[PDB]
Design a protein around this nucleic acid. Structure first.
Ligand code: FES
Ligand SMILES: [K+]
Ligand SMILES: [Mg+2]
Ligand SMILES: [Mg+2]
Ligand SMILES: [Mg+2]
Ligand SMILES: [Mg+2]
Ligand SMILES: [Mg+2]
Ligand SMILES: [Mg+2]
Ligand SMILES: [Mg+2]
Ligand SMILES: [Mg+2]
Ligand SMILES: [Mg+2]
Lengths: 86, 97, 135, 100, 137, 49
RNA sequence: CCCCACUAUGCUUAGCCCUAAACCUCAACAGUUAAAUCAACAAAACUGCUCGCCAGAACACUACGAGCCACAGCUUAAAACUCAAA
């Protein structure tokens, strides 16, 4: 309200490509967490429920990052069989 | 006994521990140029340490400095000051097209 | 008649006992050899346990006095552009050549570390060795 | 005057090398599977490097090559594991061929 | 010069122009994309109203006021009244995630207006009023 | 059915060195083919089914 | 259940009331990783020491008594009848 306008969340259109400008803006708001924050703010999440989800999300990220690391590590040996026939 | 036996000591080949870009430097709430490097250009959102690469201590100092600078009249809240858009990009985030 | 309780004693103890009890009419072909030339440890099943609290493995890191010289040499001059040949058991790298000269000069009575390191580089340069400082 | 094991270990090139990260070593191709080169460089485990695009035909069984070592044994401990997972191979980057 | 998605900053000396007008002088299309309606007001850089259209003013009612085709129709209507007043280039400021958020912008273009920038001003409270309780459906 | 004669003599020693695999003939063939592939490296359709 | 409006209430102040799945459902302190690793599951298995607590189910977060700014309240907390399970 008290800030300058046309600086925050503002994307310029290139060569009249408004679809790409809108997608860029949508990607910015998504990465910064705004799109998902507006949605969660439509109805009140009860504090006990917010902690449960924030803890589930935190643990799914740790589990997915750890499962990706394991697959990358064990994919080094995906090469062809060096001792075929034995 | 025997001269060629191993000897007890600390690892001589040990490498120094990693350091964040701001390790050893004072973070002041008046240094808005530095603080602006860790907020989103479009939304002013403070970046998490997974984007800034800062350690827990400096992530906290930067966060506390930003919050102080914002409410004391030194730093905008809803966007990165456009004067600082051409500063070195030290954050691991890719936005445009 | 026998025993397949592999976690109860060892094949020797189980075999010896059943021979005494008359369960085994004949000793197996290996029994007399084991008795004459037994292993250092009797092969008894054990369950490996996980360490907790203040329990730590007794294995020690292998270090040598020359490792301090090697750590400094790699920091100052980096790894030599010459390639290690680990197949030759008598291979000498630039670092090992540096360490040997560094050891000789220390035995000549010099005790300073920063001075004993600069004089060593000069000696090798005189001998034709290439020492390109990393920085 | 029989050399002890402690003496062999102290004066072995592998001991003298120190850490293996970013160390240039000479390897020998001992097994080839398509474009996968299996190279022994004097360690416990071989490394596997893909045939270079340039002068690919020069890399044959017995060809001696230059490597930049990264790890002598690729191992990692994953969450909920009591020991380390090992792929039983060294990590190295193939630079080229060694010539006299 | 390379294209910058960042808008020109007022007070600096930019070379960008639209019909000889600077970014600060281009009229603004304010799109309110609600869940059940879409409202579009075009104003001048001095905040003079030039055109207004919403799905309700275009004859859509009740569950029809909140669709993509209804917002697109409202955009065309606002573009027509704005074009008569001399508007060609507009800056779009959209607040809300309703169904007419993007469709309302298309209608403005089909109506003859050229969008030079897009700004989101969806209200996000930084801690604010407590929202209503979840609907039990 | 040509079940092979007892695969060991009177002393009980099997004749074939791969007896204890249970598939000595199959693995003896795989061993011979794998060995030929090795020797070639050291050295280096419609008609039938 | 959905929509609209609105109240006690959520806030502040000054007093009360004293409850929770008040739960890491893990008492405090100290020690150990060797023995047998260990009913099961949870959350690797234990030792010393101390306090608190428990002794079939249900009756029963009940009755009576007592105390309490509590008055349709809280704390402490039975018995009879009944069952061969819980
Ligand atoms: S790593 Fe030292 S302060 Fe961040
Ligand atoms: K709980
Ligand atoms: Mg009220
Ligand atoms: Mg308040
Ligand atoms: Mg709680
Ligand atoms: Mg206590
Ligand atoms: Mg068990
Ligand atoms: Mg009872
Ligand atoms: Mg109660
Ligand atoms: Mg009561
Ligand atoms: Mg009473």
């Amino acid at each position: 309200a008290k800030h300058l306008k046309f600086i925050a969340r503002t994307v310029m259109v290139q060569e009249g490509n408004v679809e790409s400008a809108y997608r860029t803006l949508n990607r910015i708001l998504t990465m910064d967490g705004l799109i998902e924050d507006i949605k969660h703010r439509r109805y009140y999440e009860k504090p006990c429920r917010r902690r449960q989800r924030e803890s589930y999300e935190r643990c799914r990220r740790i589990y997915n990052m750890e499962m990706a690391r394991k697959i990358n590590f064990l994919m080094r040996k995906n090469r062809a069989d060096p001792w075929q026939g034995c | 006994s025997n001269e060629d036996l191993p000897i007890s000591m600390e690892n001589p080949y040990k490498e120094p521990l990693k350091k964040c870009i701001l390790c050893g430097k004072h973070v002041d709430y008046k240094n808005v140029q530095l603080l602006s490097q860790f907020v989103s250009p479009f939304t002013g959102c403070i970046y998490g340490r997974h984007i800034t690469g800062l350690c827990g201590k400096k992530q906290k100092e930067i966060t506390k400095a930003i919050k102080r600078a914002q409410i004391m009249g030194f730093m905008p809240v809803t966007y990165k000051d456009p004067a600082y858009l051409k500063d070195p990009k030290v954050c691991n985030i890719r936005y445009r097209e | 008649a026998g025993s397949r309780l592999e976690t109860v004693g060892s094949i020797f103890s189980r075999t010896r006992d059943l021979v005494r009890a008359g369960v085994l009419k004949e000793k197996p072909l290996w029994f007399d050899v084991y008795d004459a030339f037994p292993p250092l440890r009797e092969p008894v099943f054990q369950r490996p346990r996980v360490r907790y609290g203040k329990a730590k493995a007794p294995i020690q890191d292998i270090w040598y006095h020359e490792d301090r010289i090697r750590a400094k040499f790699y920091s100052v001059y980096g790894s030599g552009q010459r390639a290690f040949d680990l197949f030759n058991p008598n291979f000498k790298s630039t670092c090992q050549r540096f360490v040997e000269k560094y050891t000789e000069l220390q035995k000549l009575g010099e005790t300073d570390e920063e001075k004993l390191f600069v004089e060593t580089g000069k000696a090798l340069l005189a001998e034709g060795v290439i020492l390109r400082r990393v920085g | 005057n029989v050399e002890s094991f402690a003496s062999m270990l102290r004066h072995s090139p592998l001991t003298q090398m120190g850490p293996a990260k970013d160390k240039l070593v000479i390897g020998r191709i001992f097994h080839i599977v398509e474009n996968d080169l299996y190279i022994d460089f004097g360690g416990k485990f071989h490394c596997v490097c893909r045939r270079p695009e340039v002068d690919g035909e020069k890399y044959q069984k017995g060809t001696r090559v230059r490597l930049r070592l990264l790890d002598l044994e690729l191992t990692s401990r994953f969450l909920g594991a009591t020991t380390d997972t090992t792929v039983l191979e060294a990590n190295a980057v193939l630079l080229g061929i060694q010539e006299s | 010069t390379k294209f910058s998605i960042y808008p020109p900053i007022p007070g600096e000396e930019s070379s960008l122009r639209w019909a000889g007008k600077k970014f600060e002088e281009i009229p603004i299309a304010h799109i309110k994309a609600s869940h059940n309606n879409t409202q579009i007001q075009v104003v001048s850089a001095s905040n003079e109203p030039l055109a207004f259209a919403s799905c309700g003013t275009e004859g859509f009612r009740n569950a029809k006021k909140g669709t993509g085709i209804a917002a697109q129709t409202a955009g065309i209507a606002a573009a027509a009244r704005a074009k008569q007043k001399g508007v060609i280039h507009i800056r779009v400021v959209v607040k809300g995630l309703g169904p007419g958020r993007l469709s309302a912008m298309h209608g403005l273009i089909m109506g003859g207006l050229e969008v030079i920038s897009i700004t989101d001003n969806t209200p996000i409270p930084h801690x604010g009023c407590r929202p209503r309780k979840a609907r039990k459906l | 059915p040509r079940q092979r004669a007892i695969q060991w003599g009177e002393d009980g020693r099997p004749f074939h060195y791969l007896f204890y695999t249970g598939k000595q003939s199959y693995y003896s063939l795989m061993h011979d083919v794998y060995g030929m592939l090795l020797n070639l490296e050291k050295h280096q359709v419609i008609g039938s089914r």
